[PDB]
Amino acid sequence: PRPRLPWFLRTFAVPIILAWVAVVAILNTV
Amino acid sequence: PRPRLPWFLRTFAVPIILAWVAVVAILNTVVPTLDEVGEMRAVSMAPNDAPSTLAIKRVGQVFEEYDTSSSVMIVLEGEEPLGIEAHAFYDKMVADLRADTEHVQHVQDFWGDTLTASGAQSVDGKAAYVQVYIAGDQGESLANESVEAVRKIATERETPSGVKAYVTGAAATSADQRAEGDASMKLIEGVTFAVITVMLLAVYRSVITTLIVLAMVVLGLSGARGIVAFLGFYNVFGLTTFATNMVVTLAIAAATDYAIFLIGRYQEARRAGEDRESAYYTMFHGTAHVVLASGLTIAGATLCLHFTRLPYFQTMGVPLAIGMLIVVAAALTAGPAVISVVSRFGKTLEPKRFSRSPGWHRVGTATVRWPGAILVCAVVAALIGLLALPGYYTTYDDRRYLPDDVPANVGYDAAFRHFSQAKMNPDLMMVETDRDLRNPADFLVIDKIAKALKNVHGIAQVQTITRPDGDFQRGMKLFMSPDGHAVRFTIIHQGDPLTEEGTARMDELKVAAADAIKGTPFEGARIYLGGSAATYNDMQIGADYDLIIVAASALILIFIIMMVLTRAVVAAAVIVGTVVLSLASAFGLSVLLWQHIVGIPLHWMVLPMSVIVLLAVGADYNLLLVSRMKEEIHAGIRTGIIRAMVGTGAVVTAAGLVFAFTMASMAVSSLITIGQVGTTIGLGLLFDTLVVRSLMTPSIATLLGRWFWWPQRVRERPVPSKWPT
Secondary structure: OOOHHHHHHHHOHHHHHHHHHHHHHHHHHO | OOOHHHHHHHHOHHHHHHHHHHHHHHHHHHOOOHHHHHHHOEOOOOOOOOHHHHHHHHHHHHHOOOOOOEEEEEEEEEOOOOOHHHHHHHHHHHHHHHHOOOOEEEEEOOOOOOOOHHHHEOOOOOOEEEEEEEOOOOOOHHHHHHHHHHHHHHHOOOOOOOEEEEEEOHHHHHHHHHHHHHHHHHHHHHHHHHHHHHHHHHHHOOOHHHHHHHHHHHHHHHHHHHHHHHHHHOOOOOEOHHHHHHHHHHHHHHHHHHHHHHHHHHHHHHHOOOOHHHHHHHHHHHHHHHHHHHHHHHHHHHHHOOOOOOHHHHOOHHHHHHHHHHHHHHHHHHHHHHHHHHOOOOOOOOOOOOOOOHHHHHHHHHHHHOHHHHHHHHHHHHHHHHHHOOOOOEEOOHHHHOOOOOHHHHHHHHHHOOOOHHHHOOEEEEEEOOOOOOOHHHHHHHHHHHHHHHHOOOEEEEEOOOOOOOOOHHHHHHHEOOOOOEEEEEEEEOOOOOOHHHHHHHHHHHHHHHHHHOOOHHHHOEEEEEOHHHHHHHHHHHHHHHHHHHHHHHHHHHHHHHHHHHOOHHHHHHHHHHHHHHHHHHHHHHHHHHHHHHOOOEEOOHHHHHHHHHHHHHHHHHHHHHHHHHHHHHHOHHHHHHHHHHHOOHHHHHHHHHHHHHHHHHHHOOOHHHHHHHHHHHHHHHHHHHHHHHHHHHHHHHHHHHHHHOOOOOOOOOOOOOOOO
16 A cells, blocks of 8 residues: 555656756756 | 559569669759759849849849849958958959949959058958959859859959969859759768668667568658659759758658658568568558648648748759659558569568567556546656747747858958958938939038938948039949949948848938938939848748748648548547647747757758758658558557557657667758757757657547547546456
């Protein structure tokens, strides 16, 4: 009975880290 | 009970190959090569109906000097300040240029006239530019010959020691832009073949099979070049430098992907355990309509590019449509025919990978149990590209996109060492009447106009009769009509005339002239203000409008075509909609790659050209999955999505990679604009192949279920069966 929000964060943790890194790179370069 | 169409291809494959061989041979022998044909059919890139173009054309008509709108300038750069010897050498060139009435209609000599000698001459006095009108408009084949002839005259003379002439002009740069695309066209073809050859070796893990794919690509490319050149020679339609390169590149990529679709499906059929005969029919049955629909989708996108106000796009869509039809015809005919014959002689097309795809097994499974979680991840990828939208901008000067080896670029750089870009393109305002203005009363008003024009900000020197260099009968000859009914004002801008500020100056100059003419007989005069700055602005207004029209029209046609094949309104809407999201992310990546990393902003033509290709090609990849989904939807929608991803796994990925690499192979072109189009299209394919194809589309179909295929009624899951023994 795991809630969707924590389960989604744990199951798909790897893409989330990549997204934040990508965002920072765009802001610093652009 | 084989159908007639596949049976006829296999049974009579040998004569079919000869028929296509016969067609290719005739085209390349009767008609010259596409590069030679393209030069003859060089369409003018400057609209004739442009107000700036019409005004400049009217100036010659009123002044009884010329009728064209193109006028290049020759920079007689010298090591030392130019004396009488160089001036006499310059004067001799004036007579020679005016002698060649075939290419030169009028020479606007300023250095020769002491009244305006300083304006044409450099500040250091070591160089001078002369505006010489050349027959034909920018982009016209006649203009290209005119540019060479004028440059030939500049070269065909004994230049004084230390003095060198440099012909510069946008039309000259445009003419040189043709050569760079044409010269690198062979180089692009060579690089494209090498990249394709390596990928075929990697994907198929074979040497004989790789040659089979290359053989079909050669037939398509040779036929595609011939027919486009064939129609061009007989003046069916003109050809654009971009169109010639795009036709070759798109034809190569389209044919190769079609070959991968057939062979990939055939090997997939072979892996199932089917015999060679059955696998051939299974390949044709399950892919012909998909390939046929892909060709129509590409043909529709190319056709929509004809409905443009800009002549460059208007004369480009039809050649693109003709070229793609040959590839689709060749792939649908030669493809099955060649596969039928070659598979007989040895075990060549049989698979060698012998590898299942656990990666697609796991990825597809995630998209089924938790489509929402996967869909959210797909949405995030699209949002990333949108971050670069606010920082997106484009420049207009083409010299940025041409290498320094261009002779126009050499003259362009030489001029700036002593002149300014404002002196390179001094915009012209003509005040035309039906009454003679060669009287002091009209001269007072004309001088009043000259005073008013100089009051306008952003104007350096209002060169005219009353202001020879912005501050007499020769000026009347130079700056007024032979009957004296008109007067022209050579307006020199401040800083960069080729900017939005220069366009705003025109409105101020028009109003200031309008105020000056008011209260005088000039109040009924006609003002004709035009120049290079307005010419670039006219392109953008056409480009901005044509960008919306073609993109919107293409989506409508793709919606119809997909709906016809898929037989489902909701399913067709998803296919078209998902591609639109991809282009939003695709466009951002191209902006980031060039504007912020390379530092060279994208050309204004890059966006309209890339939109059509991305929409058409992107939609085709989704159709491959959707068509496969419809075949496998019978055993449950959720299961059908899993098998469709497995069925079309690396097959589309290899096809997507090949198409992306072919567009990426355009970067070898010397012209940056050609490379920018390839990168923009190439990057979009990677996003669509990986994100939209594998994640966004399968997730949506899981949620919608029966509604996805409405009105064609489908079941979410079939009747549950009992467990077998």
